[PDB]
């Protein structure tokens, strides 16, 4: 009833993919483009 | 590599079981025009069974 917005609330963010799993009590704030799958794509999104 | 295929509604299915798959020559060989594959990467299929 508060944080929800019409058409989705894009203020908050979440990292779907990362090169490795974070340990408990660890912070990664990096918003850049990194490797998603098993093939390193060298930065900008592409190459599966 | 078959000479002639079937139609789009006549499509034939070949059962693949009890086999070992090498996907490096089917993808990284750059012998195919394009591929669109969802849910899994082409390199992951070699380490996934």
From Swiss-Prot, chain B:
High-level lineage: Viruses, Riboviria, Orthornavirae, Pisuviricota, Pisoniviricetes
UniProt protein name: Spike protein S1
Subunit record text: Binds to host ACE2. RBD also interacts with the N-linked glycan on 'Asn-90' of ACE2. Cleavage of S generates a polybasic C-terminal sequence on S1 that binds to host Neuropilin-1 (NRP1) and Neuropilin-2 (NRP2) receptors. Interacts with host integrin alpha-5/beta-1 (ITGA5:ITGB1) and with ACE2 in complex with integrin alpha-5/beta-1 (ITGA5:ITGB1). May interact via cytoplasmic c-terminus with M protein. May interact (via N-terminus) with host bilirubin and biliverdin, thereby preventing antibody binding to the SARS-CoV-2 spike NTD via an allosteric mechanism.
Residues carrying a glycan: 1
Species in which this protein is naturally found: Severe acute respiratory syndrome coronavirus 2
Effect on the protein of changing residue 31 to P: In strain: Omicron/BA.1, Omicron/BA.2, Omicron/BA.2.12.1, Omicron/BA.2.75, Omicron/BA.4, Omicron/BA.5, Omicron/BQ.1.1, Omicron/XBB.1.5, Omicron/EG.5.1
Full protein stretch here: 343 to 391 of 1273
Reported function: Attaches the virion to the cell membrane by interacting with host receptor, initiating the infection. The major receptor is host ACE2. When S2/S2' has been cleaved, binding to the receptor triggers direct fusion at the cell membrane. When S2/S2' has not been cleaved, binding to the receptor results in internalization of the virus by endocytosis using host TFRC and GRM2 and leading to fusion of the virion membrane with the host endosomal membrane. Alternatively, may use NRP1/NRP2 and integrin as entry receptors.
């Amino acid at each position: 009833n508060l944080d929800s917005k019409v058409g989705g609330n894009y203020n908050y963010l979440y990292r779907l993919f990362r090169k490795s799993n974070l340990k408990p009590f660890e912070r990664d704030i990096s918003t850049e483009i990194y490797q998603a799958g098993s093939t390193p794509c060298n930065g900008v999104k592409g190459f599966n | 590599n078959a000479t002639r295929f079937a139609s789009v509604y006549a499509w034939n299915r070949k059962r693949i079981s009890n086999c070992v798959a090498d996907y490096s020559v089917l993808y990284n060989s750059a012998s195919f025009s394009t591929f669109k594959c969802y849910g899994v990467s082409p390199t992951k299929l070699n380490d996934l069974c």
